[PDB]
Subunit: 292 residues, 4 copies
């Protein structure tokens, strides 16, 4: 099991270190354009080995020839639509020149548009190119609820599809606590509130840090996707995948529930949304084709 992470910023590195800590890889390589930073973080991590009790092999780098034969490749190269578009494009063309068939996990922004670009340049079966966005929105929504009711977050489930911001589409009917729907525990408008906080969730953290962006929750989400693929668990998680018929949408990427195994997207789950929700989902997938 060998994994490559592109981008040595807070997201890429936090992801890398978590992967070695849980022993979900034998080899790992942190890579970036700028000389210095990656080689640094990788060594520190490796030196953490005798304490964490893990024997992974970490190494930062600036040379793509090290990414050769990677089973999994995560792209965090993101900063605007023009800027990130050319970046993902170039990152992908390169990784493909050294790895035959990897599972790519996009993490840029706008997330869907960027996952679309990667896939087209990868020349890979769409069952190997995914985007991380559902697990994050769901993690925040789950945390606000736990604050509202005071229960372990392990016993909560939140349903979120679509994209981010005004393109996000949460499904109240499938958000429960120990199986119990949320609409039987909290008032409707009190819920409309927890929802709005989730849409602007990423811009709230940014408001504090003054500089940069959140990275603890976003990086852990990516590792849940990795853990399922590596251990072949068959978890069911919301991700940005390519549709072709489902939900009345064809030829474009959107966030919907899916089963994840050692082969990637091993099954898409199509669920019953009501009028207002399904409408939005189809409305979100549209702006994407408008810029792709």
């Amino acid at each position: 099991m060998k994994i490559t992470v592109i981008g040595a910023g807070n997201v890429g590195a936090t992801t890398a270190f978590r992967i070695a800590d849980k022993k979900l890889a034998r080899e790992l390589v942190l890579l970036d354009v700028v000389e210095g930073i990656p080689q640094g973080k990788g060594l520190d991590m490796y030196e953490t080995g005798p304490v964490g009790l893990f024997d992974t092999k970490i190494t930062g780098s600036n040379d793509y020839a090290d990414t050769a034969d990677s089973d999994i490749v995560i792209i965090t190269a993101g900063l605007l639509l023009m800027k990130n578009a050319g970046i993902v494009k170039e990152v992908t063309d390169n990784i493909m020149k050294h790895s035959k068939n990897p599972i790519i996990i996009v993490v840029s922004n706008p997330l869907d548009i960027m996952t679309h670009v990667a896939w087209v340049r990868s020349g890979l079966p769409k069952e190997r190119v995914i985007g991380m966005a559902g697990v994050l929105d769901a993690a925040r929504f789950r945390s606000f609820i736990a604050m509202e009711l005071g229960v372990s977050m392990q016993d909560i489930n939140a349903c979120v599809l679509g994209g981010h911001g005004d393109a996000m589409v949460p499904v109240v009917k499938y958000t429960t606590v120990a199986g119990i729907p949320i609409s039987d525990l909290l008032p409707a408008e009190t819920i409309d509130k927890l929802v709005e906080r989730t849409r602007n969730g990423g811009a709230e953290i940014v408001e504090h840090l003054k500089q940069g962006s959140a990275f603890y929750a976003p990086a852990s989400s990516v590792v849940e996707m990795v853990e399922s693929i590596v251990l072949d668990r068959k978890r069911v998680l919301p991700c940005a995948v390519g549709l072709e018929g489902q939900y009345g949408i064809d030829k474009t990427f959107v966030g919907v529930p899916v089963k994840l195994g050692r082969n990637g997207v091993e099954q898409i789950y199509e669920i019953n949304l009501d009028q207002a929700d399904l409408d939005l989902l189809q409305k979100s997938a549209k702006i994407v084709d408008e810029n792709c």
Copy 2:
């Protein structure tokens, strides 16, 4: 179990997160003097509870009142040494910062155990101790563990074996103050002098001496934090779960190794009450003198403040 971590830079945050992720505390506070930074890192850290499977209450703040009744406090504020900065120039900022933090938290926690990670370690560990007013068994600094880490990973790269089967004995402090005892560095209870060439051992020892500098060389700005943060937690764990680990740490001595009253890194048994036992191993002359040497020099700076 309530735990406070002072300072929201890469070293503190990473230490706070890992503590939460390991379920070693029920409540955790992240405090710094800056405005939104501790608030943001704290929230994003909590929003990870779902994925990580932990229920620790996490709060980032600017108000020391939030640390009331903490069982353990960890100081990281300060910073190593900004490039192009004077050695005495840093012995001023940090010493002034460490005695101010300690001052403020004793206003809310009466008998915590404190762990210092402010540089230079051996000196600052002494400053926090006196300002606190606690018995010496309740104040320790983190330093031996991290050097034993890097040193153990170099022996691994050379022999190609598991880092879990290598024990590295490292006394003293950093720089030329470090006292790596090779006669007690093993692989499956076998002295590395029986395996490696004396020529290579010396080179491994020298890399350990400048280990922190190596990282900073590549990062250009700021310093290492993954290995340090994890070395601090290994100590936290032995306390929280009363393991009685025999680990190398900075503690005040009272006669052993010929030294008295000064803070030196040596083998100690760590438990719920702190420093529960100190071991005096049979160092050969050369090492003993080197330790008594870097010890007296420490006394100096404590006498220039």
Copy 3:
């Protein structure tokens, strides 16, 4: 955190071991009336610490004095019915053992939280609670988690997903006492009725009702213990780590579900203080009826004792 486990058969040992290897206690006692077995097994578990990486005091004995001041006490005495046994015979032998043990444990531990795992469940959890003297929030029984566990494992064999993405709601008690709620059983928040035909669902439901017997069919001369022991611990963890998990357990009611003073299995919030909240879910009349009815069955058996 001291913990005691009464009974050293297969369910007791397996739980004692899993608490150590998971590092949930510092001290751990394994009690059992016969001289020899509790000794050899405890020692064998202790000699496992070098390999499991845990430092927990473990020991087995034949004297209740070694349980002094336990915070959590777990009873596994009172083996389930035997082949040629009547419900009358078992209810007699077991209530006689369950109250003689409780008497002894309260003669050394003043305020422990007790977790009952004897047969029949709901009745023995009531017997222990009246001999104890503790508030009802500190005496609970294990059953709902084991049943919901088997149910989830069954739904997974069907849809081929992670046992971790399935919620299984199960109230009442074992056998025909069991009241599995389908409306609130899901996969990623999706009710299984939206993903499975009525015929299959009903089969999974009935495999759960006789689950334990299914394990005795293969074993031939004994009952299950791996799954049962782990369900026990799941609960121990919520208490010790103050997680506040929502799980179905055997607790005393006083109004909700129109039930009063009787021990029933329902959804309860678990913390460091035992039972901190009981939920009243919007069940459908048919299931609500099965519950109230099955409860009076407990009230009947309790008086004949």
Copy 4:
């Protein structure tokens, strides 16, 4: 990663479970001779997955066809005691090889050294892929005995034990440390002598207690230790029973010595510097074990 355990007694059962709980496998198979037992314990473990939080495919069985293409195979079957168990190992082996091309094999019988030998020959595999567990167990007991003596974590105690069990055990005092410190600088020679004695009779101590059976918690954790190294390719260094072709002056025999475990098994054997006293004893050990 697919593993197979043979024997559903306390040892192999506990063993299969620990592997499942550690997520060290995708498919596990518990096979035994009698019907019922292996299918019951196996289903029990599987129904634990929703709580232990794993998704390992476990299954009990009585038909060797389910063990096809196993990476690791753990033989833990064992009850003229010598010829008794020797025949059981031969049988088990032949069948396994009938369904798996190239697997790593771990023997857990008695006598261990001889049993691992019998398994190797019938195996027809490179001696590098057939090994026996014993050293790691005696060391875990020694390590715990000392910790009880000093009151220190067991994670900081290292123990050196070569050879076989009982009168064939060879403890190397000079390599038994505590955070690097030899134990001869911490404890009296009389105290050490008793700690060594108690270890020589370590298994008979648990047996005289239980009065019906034998240890299995420590024995099973030891085996999983070896499995993890191979699976995760850590390169751990542990004392296991291997076939020697010269080292320590012993030839064509299986005896316990430090080795390095990787994905391909025995990736290196270490010939440590024993003292004229113990060396002579290790030679007389492999003498009867020959």
